[PDB]
Design a protein around this ligand. Structure first.
Ligand SMILES: Nc1ccn([C@@H]2O[C@H](COP(=O)(O)OP(=O)(O)OP(=O)(O)O)[C@@H](O)[C@H]2O)c(=O)n1
Ligand SMILES: [Mg+2]
Lengths: 251, 50, 1341, 277
RNA sequence: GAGU
DNA sequence: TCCGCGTCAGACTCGTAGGATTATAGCATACGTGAG
DNA sequence: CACGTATGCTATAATGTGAGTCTGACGCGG
């Protein structure tokens, strides 16, 4: 692919394929030319070296260093490592309708609520706004609905308030050591950029407000909403699954 | 360490007691960075098995 | 005796220990080191001189041609730091080197009388260090960090078990050169000595001695002590050395003369030994059976036959003894090898050694390094000599040779860089001594074995690499070419050297963006030591032992400043007084104690020197101008600490601060803080963003002023004198005659840097400290940098703080702030953000920066001017266009809808897109500045041209005012010289100053002064011309940019960010918090006096944290402000200068045993009211580190303020008006706003762009990224029920391409149904496994 | 434990015969006549020469082995086109061929985006000129400075130096540590966000409803011209193929369809609302 | 380089 | 059973920067496709 | 027919190479 700078950027697999093809074609040539056997042999060694580098580089001894000095990333290297494809792209992923910000106390909240910044929530529930806007006939189409949100018009806030009602949001803190590291709350729209967390659940998250942050995630489907409200809600996860004693307690 | 810190924080440590404190402190901090990994690796081995 | 800037505001000192040595220049290291690299020394191989003499002279392979180095020179820098920073170029000097191509005749033997060609060739530009200690690389300020590595020399180490559950300690020696292969010696479980060259395969140690031409008998004579066996008549005798037996058990009945000393089968004690020695025992009769096992030393042959009866190093028997006797030998030299002390190691290693002679040994060595390749004798001698015995490939360096010689207990420090045969044997000897039990192992973590490499050494090395790459090219071309036509410059290439150095100063790990959040951040970064990067440890390699505090770190490295992270213990801040010895070891100052009396004689001791002396503690009480008060002084030696008598004491700690680094020195009551919390405190001070109003710290230490001055961010006066002209831009000082040189005009101009961008996009602004017409001395602060008060360092703002709960608004470290803080714009911070718009040339054609942009509102284009550039001063908000840019879009095949749409509005606006630079979303600021960089040939924009008009006329004005003030100041002197011996006061002023070339007086020294002033006047006259031509050239000069790029417009936004919930704040005792709520003034707890508290912090975040420093800081802070409130009250009521003077003298001279004396009096009345006006906003106090204020001194100070001794006050709730039920601790904590603003942290995303291969959403707020749903987070949903939430997160939310669009449509349609698919990552996985040649198929139902 | 491909090959070459002058003449005459053994022995004996030049041609593009093999190709052509009748030695002639084939291969294989020898040769002269400029101008060559010296166009010099720009690895993690690879920064550009794709869905759906809101002869002429309902995007003149068969009446009716549709966008709530877009 |  | 080899090495966040590095001969015929 | 790309030939003799090291715990195989 072309970078913006006019330059190109490519996978190392291209360098390894080019190695293999060059040496293979040169071998075809030296066979057409009836070359003496010492030279044919050298080319057959080099061909096996190139294929072995292409499949799994570094296993057959000294890995082939490209441009920096770093060994070229081979096929097996894209599967194998923790970084491969299994651990990185398949057993966990980056996710839409996800946000984060610093957390701060909400002592006024009840146990099942959390302060969610206005601008953050505007963005996370964008399709849900577009949807209600068209059912009220306030927006003629989606692009007009988008421009009404861009302009952050006063009627849009009222619609957004209506969508967030009874809609649960997942709060997550790193690291997620046990299941209570994710909990569902009913959000409360708040002016300001910080997420407000109920004190009593700070225990499960191991949340202390000296700059910790949290991920927000929006359960989209009816099923996901129900699993959040019934199974993952703060109120419903009072006792530790580890021992009988509850985690959500005053301190 | 064979020599304990006789003083407390209200009293204030002296240069020697503070320097001696450092060892324990930094081993604690290095422990959180490095060992977390083996704790976490055990969580992950456990999860894969069950 | 106080300086002018201290007369304005004096800090009260609670320190009691008189400082014999002042804090040195803190950025000493960076400047000295680089200065050594560029420094022209004829002899002292330092930097370039060394580099050239090392490589050169390079002689050809044929040997006819050679290139030799004469000298080098740095051209002056093409662009100043300023132009480099703006343009985005490296600040460097061109390196021009004189080189002489000399040629020999092949016909004559070594006739040098053929061709000598000498010329000055360019080899790269070398980046220059700024006077501050930084490099400007591609227009960015960067700092190169000193390194800590294992010192060249020898090291004796030992696997403590590890290998072989046997649990054998295997001893090893490692010889480390500065350059060359490593030489390892090691033991094996079977006590065989082995050599690893370059840590390759193992070889028997004796083989290396054979390579150095050692016969077997000579080897044994080297390691082993001989024993003499005389065969007299028939009985066997042996020459006894009284001790040798010693701690052995007697195997035979030992009889001496006729009388029995030892009993057979009993252990020989000290009495037997002294009895035998005193009796003078030299022969003892022994059984023949005892020799079975003894090792013969020499070759013994039959003088009759001339054949070898027994070879050297062979185990004797009863029959070999018999054969030896009858041949005619009645003397047998045997080896002494008694286990325990004298082990037969080399004896056994010779038996393992397969080689015989020297050649056989050299072949085996050759075969190890180059296995397969047949030996030749020439090849094996060459290889072995080129390993450790070649001046070119092996160099211990002076430090290597020095540490080597001291480790082997030599007398001589200096010697050869190449290993001698004696060196290697001495090392083997010491190894074996250590195995035996006499001698000890060296410690790797010991600072006596860890050496510091700063910049100049590192620049030197990269520069040597460049030269080596050049040497191959040069030698290659010297041999091939005809010698006579060919000159030296066609052979040299500059690009290799330039590339080596460019890669160091730009790509290197140690070259990093200067941490410019604040002065302390900068100063601490420039004194960093890293064990990482090239030639050092890795995070993988780094254990637990290296990381922890070593005893030798005392006075050299900070124990409490290290990143809390993976780099914990590998990165180290240097201690305050610490410095590098000539060889590069760290050393620390100590006061010599002579005859018990403690002199002011100060000695810097290295890690190794320190171990040897007993050093008293700094807190040790000295008696008034002589010896220690106390009999048993608390001292430390041999790395451990206890009581000593006075006569034993050799030395003492110079300051109480020398243990600690710079950053930790700024923490007031460090003594009362846990070391962990203190570490994070010193770490967060570096993160402190300078506020709009730089506020001094009420509770300081004294390092405040040192740091502000040494950082270089403050303008300091070199010459002093009186200020002629202040301006919010410049300061001109007229110098005093005593420092003012009679050559040049004596007027100093300091230009102040106005509101400039930092690397962290913070604001750098210099404001003038002094007023118009103020007298100043050398080293007075003339202008304050960004986070500095009148000369002192001011990282944040002190505040009225109360420790008490609020309605959970301070739950876990959460902070409750008064609205008054926001109103007073305290912790309001300035961010200058730099945005670039790049006009590139594409395959379709060049991009245009016109205001003429397809499909754009008049609202948007209002703010752009003719060229398409926003106006200076224009306020902008997200989505506003800053620089309009349009890109040629060729082959614009439209969708039918777009054909219709473009037909309806007719706004075809032609085949051009919209790629305009617009304000990033949600950031909002005012445009302060615009810069345009164009190529040379391309026609200038109208706006670019008016910018150059401004710069040209402004340049003309600047230079004109230079020549005018310099001429006025110069003739003002001529006027005074002419009066000397020629009274013409009124008569000289009337005729014009321009016609004063005619004016002289009689031929004396005063006539010569007139000549000096006249030659300078004209010198300045032409100088002004060539300066103006330079400026004009740089202003017209078109800049060479990246290929593809036609022009670049840089916009600077000025953003004012207000403090707000989510913002991170901390103190200096590692006490952090996030602001939870901003409370109305009415609501905040208030005093009996009605004064509301600024910040409400939680009590419960102190006793658990064990940082008690913050509470002492708060009590003292209130006492400081108590006295400020009294002075404020006396200044409001005018009152008497006498009365103010009384109160202020009683105040400064309060403390029980205050070191600092302040005999107020001498202060003139005007100095006193300027001082009180500064002391009014709270009397600033200094609590040194470990010599701080005592509780009793703080309570005494509180009583002087009429504040309570408890430092707790009655508080009233703002809301209810009722009192809180018990007293609350209130006072002033100096607080910091860290760089972590919620404004640049808060991120949200519904749908966005998606990754290239994996199709998952991107990461990071800059790329508008989704939060990563990690394994850990998945497992949580697995534990719950939540299966749909999990699938959602796996599929329609990430990869599933069809699914995500379909479900988006459903959510706008209000269906809330998933309709899942297949994640694109998996399709790829399959393809990647089939690419491996594994068939992986999906099997259907 | 000789495992290395290179050291094995260099062991094999060392094990060869070294040829003299009279020997080269005898084998060379037999070789050109078409001897099997003569060709093989001349090649095998002169492999050492390939390596000596191949060793002094590394760190530029390919690996030592790679250069050694392409260099060997030069040796073969050298043996094929050697003239033993000329008194001048083989080593001299072979050196040319070995250097030629190595250089040619290094100019083609090295660069990921394959650059033609014509441009590469031009590039050579630009760079050599830059070197001589650099030795005297303490600074580095500008594009214009190089163009002045060669008496050539600035634009042509700039195109060439742009082609010099070597490729960045996508798979390489950048942030000093192996943190984030460039791949994961760089988004699929051809690919529109679901927001933009859904906007096109809304437009395309509205059009269908907009085609059954105007006149029957106003949506038939307007749609089939732009290629909205029809199969091919025709022009005002080409709408005559269907049934319209007019030039003026097609243009009046096209614009009449768009004018009534402009009022349909002003009333629904777009027009200037959807003008910015 | 820093964040948890 | 002694010991060389290979396999792991906790989870998420943001910030960067460098494009940098490099050398190669020059010219005539041959092979092949595209444009006017 | 021009333009873009490729295969061709050159003649003093020259004919043998050439980074970074030190992690630590466990589980099989030679
Ligand atoms: N390197 C780190 C640092 C922190 N954390 C997480 O962040 C929490 C808070 O870290 P920190 O603020 O250092 O500790 P606290 O217990 O909050 O103590 P304090 O803030 O008072 O120092 C830890 O419990 C842990 O879950 C982590 O996972 N890895
Ligand atoms: Mg925290």
């Amino acid at each position: 692919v072309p970078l913006d700078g006019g330059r190109f950027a490519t996978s190392d697999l291209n360098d390894l394929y080019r190695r293999v093809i060059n040496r293979n074609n040169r071998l075809k040539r030296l066979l057409d030319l009836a070359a003496p056997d010492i030279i044919v042999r050298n080319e057959k060694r080099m061909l096996q070296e190139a294929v072995d580098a292409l499949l799994d580089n570094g296993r057959r001894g000294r890995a082939i260093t490209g441009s920096n000095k770093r060994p070229l990333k081979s096929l097996a290297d894209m599967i194998k490592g923790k970084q491969g494809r299994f651990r990185q792209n398949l057993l966990g992923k980056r996710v839409d309708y996800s946000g984060r910000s610093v957390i701060t106390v909400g002592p006024y909240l009840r146990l099942h609520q959390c302060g969610l910044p206005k601008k953050m929530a505007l963005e996370l529930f964008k399709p849900f706004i577009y949807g209600k806007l068209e059912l009220r006939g306030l927006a003629t189409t989606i692009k007009a609905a988008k421009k009404m949100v861009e302009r952050e018009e006063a009627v849009v806030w009222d619609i957004l308030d209506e969508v967030i009602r009874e809609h649960p949001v997942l709060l997550n803190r790193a690291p997620t050591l046990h299941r209570l590291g994710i909990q569902a709350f009913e959000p409360v729209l708040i002016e300001g950029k910080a997420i407000q967390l109920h004190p009593l659940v700070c225990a499960a998250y191991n949340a202390d407000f000296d700059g910790d942050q949290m991920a927000v995630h929006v359960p989209l489907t009816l099923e996901a909403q129900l699993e959040a409200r019934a199974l993952m809600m703060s109120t419903n996860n009072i006792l530790s699954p580890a021992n009988g004693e509850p985690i959500i307690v005053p301190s | 360490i064979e020599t304990p810190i006789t003083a407390n924080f209200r009293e204030g440590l002296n240069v020697l007691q503070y320097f001696i404190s450092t060892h324990g402190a930094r081993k604690g901090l290095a422990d959180t960075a490095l060992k977390t990994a083996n704790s976490g690796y055990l969580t992950r081995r456990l999860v894969d098995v069950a | 005796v106080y300086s002018y800037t201290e007369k304005k505001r004096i800090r009260k000192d609670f320190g009691k220990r008189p400082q014999v040595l002042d804090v040195p220049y803190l950025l000493s290291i960076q400047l000295d080191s680089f200065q050594k690299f560029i420094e022209q020394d004829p002899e002292g191989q330092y930097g370039l001189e060394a580099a050239f003499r090392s490589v050169f002279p390079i002689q050809s392979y044929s040997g006819n041609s050679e290139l030799q180095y004469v000298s080098y020179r740095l051209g002056e820098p093409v662009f100043d730091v300023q132009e480099c920073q703006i343009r985005g170029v490296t600040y460097s000097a061109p390196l021009r080197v004189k080189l002489r191509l000399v040629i020999y005749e092949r016909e004559a033997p070594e006739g040098t009388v053929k061709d000598i060609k000498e010329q000055e060739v360019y080899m790269g530009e070398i980046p220059l260090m700024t006077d501050n200690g930084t490099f400007v690389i591609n227009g960015t300020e960067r700092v190169i960090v000193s390194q800590l590595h294992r010192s060249p020399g020898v090291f004796f180490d030992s696997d403590k078990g590890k290998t072989h559950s046997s649990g054998k300690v295997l001893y090893n020696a490692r010889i480390i050169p500065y350059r060359g292969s490593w030489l390892d010696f090691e033991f094996d479980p079977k006590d065989n000595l082995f050599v690893r060259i370059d840590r390759r395969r193992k070889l028997p140690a004796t083989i290396i001695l054979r390579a150095l031409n050692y016969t077997t008998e000579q080897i044994l004579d080297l390691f082993f002590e001989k024993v003499i066996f005389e065969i007299r008549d028939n009985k066997l005798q042996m020459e006894l050395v009284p001790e040798r037996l010693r701690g052995e058990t007697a195997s035979f009945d030992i009889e001496a003369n006729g009388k029995v000393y030892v009993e057979k089968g009993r252990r020989i004690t000290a009495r037997h030994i002294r009895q035998l020695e005193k009796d003078d025992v030299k022969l003892i009769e022994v059984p023949v059976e005892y020799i079975a096992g003894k090792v013969v030393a020499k070759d013994y042959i039959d003088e009759s036959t001339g054949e070898l009866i027994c070879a050297a190093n062979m185990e004797l028997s009863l029959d070999l003894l018999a054969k030896l006797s009858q041949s005619g030998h009645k003397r047998i030299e045997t080896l002494f090898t008694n286990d325990l002390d004298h082990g037969p190691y080399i004896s056994e290693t010779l038996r393992v050694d397969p080689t015989n002679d020297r050649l056989s040994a050299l072949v085996e060595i050759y075969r190890m390094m180059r296995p397969g390749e047949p030996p030749t004798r020439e090849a094996a001698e060459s290889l072995f000599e080129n390993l450790f015995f070649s001046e070119d490939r092996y160099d211990l360096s002076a430090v290597g040779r020095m540490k080597f010689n001291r480790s082997l207990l030599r007398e001589e420090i200096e010697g050869s860089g190449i290993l001698s045969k004696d060196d290697i044997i001495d090392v083997m000897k010491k190894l074996i001594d250590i195995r035996n039990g006499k001698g000890e192992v060296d410690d790797i973590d010991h600072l006596g074995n860890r050496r510091i490499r700063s910049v100049g050494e590192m620049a030197e090395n990269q520069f040597r690499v460049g030269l080596v790459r050049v040497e191959r090219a040069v030698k290659e071309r010297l041999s091939l070419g005809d010698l006579d036509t060919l000159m030296p410059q066609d052979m040299i290439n500059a690009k290799p050297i330039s590339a080596a150095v460019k890669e160091f100063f730009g790509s290197s790990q140690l070259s990093q963006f200067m941490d410019q959040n604040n002065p302390l951040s900068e100063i601490t970064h420039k004194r960093r030591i890293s064990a990482l990067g090239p030639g050092g440890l890795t995070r993988e390699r780094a254990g637990f032992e290296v990381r922890d505090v070593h005893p030798t770190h005392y006075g050299r490295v900070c124990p409490i400043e290290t990143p809390e992270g993976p780099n914990i213990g590998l990165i180290n801040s240097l201690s305050v007084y610490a410095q590098t010895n000539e060889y590069g070891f760290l050393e620390t100052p100590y006061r010599k104690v002579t005859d018990g009396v403690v002199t002011d004689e100060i000695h810097y001791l290295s890690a190794i020197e320190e171990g040897n002396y007993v050093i008293a503690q700094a807190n040790s009480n000295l008696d008034e101008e002589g010896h220690f008060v106390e009999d048993l002084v608390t001292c430390r030696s041999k790395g451990e600490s206890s009581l000593f008598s006075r006569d034993q004491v050799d030395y003492m700690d110079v300051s109480t601060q020398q243990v600690v680094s710079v950053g930790a020195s700024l923490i007031p009551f460090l003594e009362h803080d846990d070391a962990n919390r203190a570490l994070m405190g010193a770490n967060m001070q570096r993160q402190a963003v300078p506020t709009l109003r730089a506020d001094k710290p009420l509770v300081g230490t004294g390092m405040e002023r040192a740091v502000a001055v040494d950082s270089g961010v403050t303008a300091v006066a070199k010459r002093g004198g009186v200020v002629q002209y202040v301006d919010a831009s410049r300061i001109v000082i007229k110098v005093n005659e005593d420092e003012m040189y009679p050559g040049e005009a004596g007027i100093d101009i300091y230009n102040l840097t106005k509101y400039t961008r930092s690397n962290q996009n913070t604001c750098i602004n210099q404001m003038p400290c002094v007023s118009l017409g103020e007298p100043v001395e050398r080293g007075d602060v003339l202008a304050d940098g960004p986070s500095t008060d009148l000369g002192e360092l001011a990282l944040g703002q002190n505040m009225r703080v109360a420790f008490m709960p609020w309605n959970g608004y301070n739950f876990e470290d959460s902070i409750l702030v008064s609205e008054r803080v926001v109103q007073e714009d305290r912790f309001t911070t300035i961010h200058i953000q730099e945005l670039a718009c790049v006009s590139r040339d594409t395959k379709l054609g060049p991009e245009e920066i016109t205001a003429d942009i397809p499909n754009v509102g008049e609202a948007a284009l209002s703010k752009l001017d003719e060229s398409g550039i926003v106006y200076i001063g224009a306020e902008v908000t997200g989505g506003d266009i800053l620089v309009g840019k349009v890109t040629p879009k060729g082959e614009t095949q439209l969708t039918p809808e777009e054909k219709l749409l473009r037909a309806i509005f007719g706004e075809k606006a032609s085949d051009v897109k919209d790629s305009s630079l617009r304000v990033p979303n949600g950031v909002s600021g005012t445009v302060i500045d615009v810069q345009v960089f164009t190529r040379d040939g391309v026609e200038k924009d109208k706006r670019a041209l008016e910018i150059e008009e401004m710069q040209l006329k402004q340049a003309k004005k600047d230079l004109s005012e230079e020549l005018q003030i310099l001429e006025a100041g110069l003739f003002s002197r001529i006027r005074a010289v002419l009066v000397a011996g020629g009274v013409e006061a009124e008569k000289l002023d009337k005729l014009p100053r321009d016609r004063w070339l005619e004016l002289g007086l009689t031929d004396e020294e005063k006539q010569n002064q007139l000549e000096q002033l006249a030659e300078q006047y004209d010198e300045l006259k032409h100088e002004f011309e060539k300066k103006l031509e330079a400026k004009r050239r740089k202003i017209t000069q078109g800049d060479d940019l990246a290929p593809g790029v036609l022009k670049i417009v840089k916009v600077y936004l000025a953003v004012k960010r207000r403090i707000q919930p989510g913002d991170k704040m901390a103190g200096r005792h590692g006490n952090k918090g996030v602001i939870s709520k901003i409370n109305p003034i009415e609501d905040m707890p208030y005093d009996e006096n009605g004064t509301p508290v600024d910040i409400v912090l939680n009590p419960l975040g102190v006793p658990s944290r064990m940082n008690i420093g913050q509470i002492l800081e708060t009590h003292l802070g209130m006492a400081a402000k108590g006295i400020g409130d009294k002075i404020n009250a006396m200044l409001k009521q005018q009152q008497e200068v006498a009365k103010l003077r009384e109160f202020i003298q009683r105040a400064y001279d309060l403390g029980a045993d205050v070191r600092q004396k302040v005999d107020l009096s001498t202060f003139s009345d005007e100095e006193v009211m300027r001082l009180a006006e500064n002391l009014r906003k709270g009397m600033p106090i200094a609590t040194p580190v470990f010599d701080g204020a005592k509780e009793a001194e703080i309570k005494e100070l509180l009583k002087l303020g009429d504040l309570p001794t408890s430092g707790q006050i009655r508080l009233y709730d703002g809301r209810t008006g009722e009192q809180f039920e018990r007293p609350v601790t209130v006072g002033y904590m100096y607080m910091l706003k860290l760089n972590h603003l919620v404004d640049d942290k808060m991120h949200a995303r519904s749908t966005g762009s998606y990754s290239l291969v994996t199709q998952q959403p991107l990461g990071g707020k800059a790329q508008f990224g989704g939060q990563r749903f990690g394994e850990m987070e998945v497992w949580a949903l697995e534990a719950y029920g939540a299966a749909y939430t999990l699938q959602e997160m796996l599929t329609v939310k990430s990869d599933d391409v069809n699914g995500r669009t379909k479900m988006y449509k459903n959510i706008v349609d209000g269906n809330h149904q998933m309709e899942p698919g297949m994640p694109e990552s998996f399709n790829v996985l399959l393809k990647e496994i089939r690419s491996l040649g594994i068939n992986i198929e999906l099997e259907d139902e | 434990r000789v495992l290395d491909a290179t050291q094995l090959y260099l062991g094999e070459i060392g094990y060869s015969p070294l040829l003299t002058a009279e020997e080269e003449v005898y084998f060379a005459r037999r070789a050109l006549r078409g001897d099997v053994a003569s060709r093989r022995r001349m090649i095998e004996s002169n492999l050492r020469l390939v390596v000596k030049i191949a060793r002094r041609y590394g760190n530029r593009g390919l690996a030592l082995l790679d250069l050694i093999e392409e260099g060997n190709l030069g040796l073969i052509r050298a043996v094929e086109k050697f003239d033993p009748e000329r008194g001048f030695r083989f080593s001299t002639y072979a050196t040319w061929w070995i250097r030629q084939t190595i250089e040619r291969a290094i100019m083609n294989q090295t660069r990921t985006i394959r650059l033609p020898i014509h441009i590469v040769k031009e590039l050579n002269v630009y760079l050599r000129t830059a070197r001589e400029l650099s030795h005297k101008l303490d600074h580095e060559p500008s594009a214009e400075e190089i163009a002045e010296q060669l008496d050539k166009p600035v634009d042509d010099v700039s195109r060439m130096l742009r082609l010099n720009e070597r490729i960045t690895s996508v798979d390489t993690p950048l942030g000093g540590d192996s943190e984030k690879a460039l791949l994961d920064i760089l988004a699929d550009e051809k690919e529109n966000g679901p927001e933009d794709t859904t906007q096109d869905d809304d437009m395309k759906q509205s059009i269908v409803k907009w085609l059954f809101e105007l006149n029957a002869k106003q949506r038939e002429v307007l749609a089939r011209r732009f290629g909205l309902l029809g199969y091919e995007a025709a022009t005002l003149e080409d709408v005559g193929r269907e049934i319209g068969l007019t030039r003026e009446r097609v243009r009046q009716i096209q614009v009449e369809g768009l004018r009534r549709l402009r009022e349909i966008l002003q009333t629904q709530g777009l027009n200037i609302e959807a003008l910015f877009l």
